[PDB]
């Protein structure tokens, strides 16, 4: 359930955040603050965006809230508090050597073993050795929010448990059952812990109740999740009794169930449908653009970073810092510039497959990340043509057409789909239909042009004694 989580004041495990922080901050009456910690600055910024508390990365939290302010009190004055964090060089094999590098080179470095986390070991050691540190953290925070917990390493887990068990801080933990990852942390809590309430959320939780309800109707497994409303507002059915341009005018100006001034996305199955639709719409005063599928639209491990590199290469106004926000950790501008220097070699005149291959190797080597050869192939293909450029564009486009595939993992405010694109009555297009119906946050329109689809909906409604699932206009 959703509102149950909101009512829940204690330690929480969620299997798959901004929602709970907003609520908890509202009803907080005390002086205590919250902290939200992510793996990436991208994830942090996204939270800080929708909101005296701490919102930042794991590494920024332990460095700024624990290590820097209290290392001298814990270890003595000969330890620095103006050290530099370095992710790339100055790796080491033991805690004592890490202490040496910090003490003598003024560098907060990393273990060479990715399963060990020097910063978090250091932070825990400092808490255990400094009353002042414990008193600060104790009186500062009442709750900490932690993202992607399945990727947390053993030392992160040790610190968070200590915060919970010694400094009386509640934990709100989100994850999904990364080189540092110890999945047993999160799994262990799920299977064994007695001091957490535990919830499971489906992928469409983000959506408004009407959109959750509709999308949950179609799979036998999610039907039980449906919480019927007396009336439906945000999922709408419209007849295909007029051209798409008239349909759009009816939705926006006549019935005003769509806002033409907000983001509006039409989902199709194929490029040729998008062309058809654009050929009409843009001749009738609209201005839609089709965002093509690209070779990087595969579920590959490094898809996100690879798309960022392409964005940077092809758009001279795109900032290297936005690329860097997607990299795990809290890299200094100095290190980001070392990454920039590597990537900039893709900008030489007459770039070719050989050079590109070399850049990719240099980059992912530096990031200590394994690269699939088929990723190199897909990346190189995008580099060597302008065919897919619009998909990596920096411009903001309000009115867009996507295939359901290109739309995967994206979120829009308003979405139009066409029933005849999904033959779910014959158990076809069922994953695509779930994806398509859950892209929208606030408004979903179904062009109802498929008799078997609509009959199928009515059949399920009768079976479930549902009276309202979609608003017909």
Residue numbers in the entry: 2 to 17, 27 to 61, 67 to 192, 199 to 494
Extract from the study:
Gabija is one of the most abundant prokaryotic antiviral systems and consists of two proteins, GajA and GajB. The other component of the Gabija system, GajB, was predicted as a UvrD-like helicase, but its function is unknown.
The asymmetric unit contained a single GajB chain and 265 water molecules. Several GajB residues (1, 18–26, 62–66 and 193–198) were not modeled in the final structure due to insufficient electron density. The crystal structure of GajB revealed a four-subdomain architecture, in which N- and C-terminal domains are each divided further into a RecA-like core subdomain and an accessory subdomain. The two accessory subdomains are formed as inserts within the respective core subdomains. GajB shares the four-subdomain architecture with UvrD that includes two RecA-like subdomains (1A and 2A) and two additional subdomains (1B and 2B). The root-mean-square deviation (RMSD) values between the Ncore and Ccore subdomains of GajB and their counterparts (the 1A and 2A subdomains, respectively) in UvrD were 1.9 Å and 2.8 Å for the 115 and 141 Cα atoms, respectively. In the Cacc subdomain of GajB, it is difficult to recognize even a partial structural resemblance to the 2B subdomain of UvrD. The gating helix and the GIG motif in subdomain 2B of UvrD, which are involved in formation of the ssDNA gateway and dsDNA binding, respectively, are missing in GajB.
